[PDB]
Amino acid sequence: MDERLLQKYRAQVFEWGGCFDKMFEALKSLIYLSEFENSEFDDEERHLLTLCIKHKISDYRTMTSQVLQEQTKQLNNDELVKICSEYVFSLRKDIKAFLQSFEDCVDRLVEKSFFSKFFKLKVKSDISRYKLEFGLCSLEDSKKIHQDAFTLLCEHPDKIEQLPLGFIQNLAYILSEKYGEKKQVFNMLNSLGKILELQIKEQENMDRKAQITVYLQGIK
Amino acid sequence: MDERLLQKYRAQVFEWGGCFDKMFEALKSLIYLSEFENSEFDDEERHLLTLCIKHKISDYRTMTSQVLQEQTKQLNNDELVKICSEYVFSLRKDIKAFLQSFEDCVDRLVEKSFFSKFFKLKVKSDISRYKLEFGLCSLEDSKKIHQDAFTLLCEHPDKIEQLPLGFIQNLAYILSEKYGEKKQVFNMLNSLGKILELQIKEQENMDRKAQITVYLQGIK
């Protein structure tokens, strides 16, 4: 066990203990080590990275809502209300800081495999949606990152099976329903569908035909 | 609003946000301020103090049990198990440190009212039970603190109504069921009962008679 494996273990154990700030410190070390050695993350490392932001955001939401709920039930205590507001503001400043640091890390992810390139853009897209909500980026800049991930997917139909189908569906869903690209997405996926139909036709192996069909169906 | 009131507010707000370590820092400041001014805690300050230890202990228990549960479900990963054990040990060391610091604070509580004297001993008793479990005190030393609180209660039957009835019942319950003083406790409470019967007999006011009866019944 070297430092990189230790940090995977520490990140998991901190996640189990609900210590998301210590988990993030271990992940920062993973990012640095992988970058230093120019060695792509494995899937367990990627999963811990996305769990970290999920948890930090969820905590922020819970803590904020708990304080605001209690604030409103205090009758006529202007001073206590001000303390609640100050605390709520600090929590928001801290989550914004977290998003900035986490995004620094994600930008430094090593890319080699097709999935690693798509993964970086997917996670950057996810970050941009939080940054949109929290006053850290424009709608234009957020949309652009989602478009970049969708473009990469569509430029390499031969490698579609290297990507999780749910990532594909969520990106399609977000771009069409939230960014007003329903027409672009339907058109691009129509084309991707045809390319997969051909892949299926040309694939001799019956089990492989069925595997590609999962994506073809998933895309419709 | 002065610093002492601010810290009451900060302690409450940190409790609402589930930030028990920040809550404890605010309480440490309350303790120092009250000690400095020789000015007894009010009941809201006392309640925040006992909430703090309740929460810290509950968190420790949850975090420990979560990590141990996951540890056992990993098949053959000796290195990850060792990391889990190291983390579990650190959490225990930290809760022990917390108990030491919290006990320092409680020892520095200002005493003036009868209830403030009983409260200090009651909280010290509660701390001693955790310290017993965590290897920080002997059974003898824990028992002694519980006896000191029970003695104070019994030496001042005229002031019984200044104490919460549940505190009295819990102390009686603990001393008789956990410290093998069933005989002492039954005897002392028999005597306290008789003193309250007399107080009731001698109290002209009917509403006051009923108020004392609540304690007389509670004690049986």
Author numbering:
A (entry chain A), B (entry chain A): 8 to 227
Paper excerpt:
Structurally, Cp14a features the classical 14-3-3 dimer but with a uniquely wide pocket and a disoriented RRY triad potentially incapable of binding phosphopeptides. Cp14a shares limited sequence identity with Cp14ε and all other known proteins. First, while the Cp14a structure also adopts the classic dimeric α-helical structure, it stands out by virtue of its unusual width. Even the second arginine and the ensuing tyrosine are skewed in their orientations with respect to what is typical in other 14-3-3 proteins, with or without ligands bound. This is the first known instance of a disoriented 14-3-3 triad (superposed on Cp14ε for comparison in Fig. 4D). The mode of dimerization of Cp14a deviates from that of other 14-3-3 proteins. While the two subunits form an aperture similar to that in the human 14-3-3 proteins and Cp14ε, the side chain interactions around the aperture are primarily hydrophobic, with Cys26 and Met70 of opposite chains occupying the position of the Arg-Glu salt bridge conserved in most other homologs. One intuitive conclusion is that this protein supports a large substrate; however, its disoriented Arg-Arg-Tyr triad, the lack of a C-terminal tail and our negative screening results make this C. parvum chaperone even more divergent from others and introduces the possibility that this is a degenerate 14-3-3 protein, or at least one that is functionally unique.
One protein family common to humans, C. parvum and in fact all eukaryotes is the group of tyrosine 3-monooxygenase/tryptophan 5-monooxygenase activation proteins (YWHA), also known as 14-3-3 proteins. All 14-3-3 proteins are dimers, with each subunit comprised of nine α-helices framing a peptide-binding cleft. The dimer is shaped like the letter “W” from one angle, with an un-partitioned bicameral pocket where a substrate protein is held at two typically phosphorylated sites in the two component clefts. The parasite Cryptosporidium parvum has three 14-3-3 proteins: Cp14ε, Cp14a and Cp14b, with only Cp14ε similar to human 14-3-3 proteins in sequence, peptide-binding properties and structure.
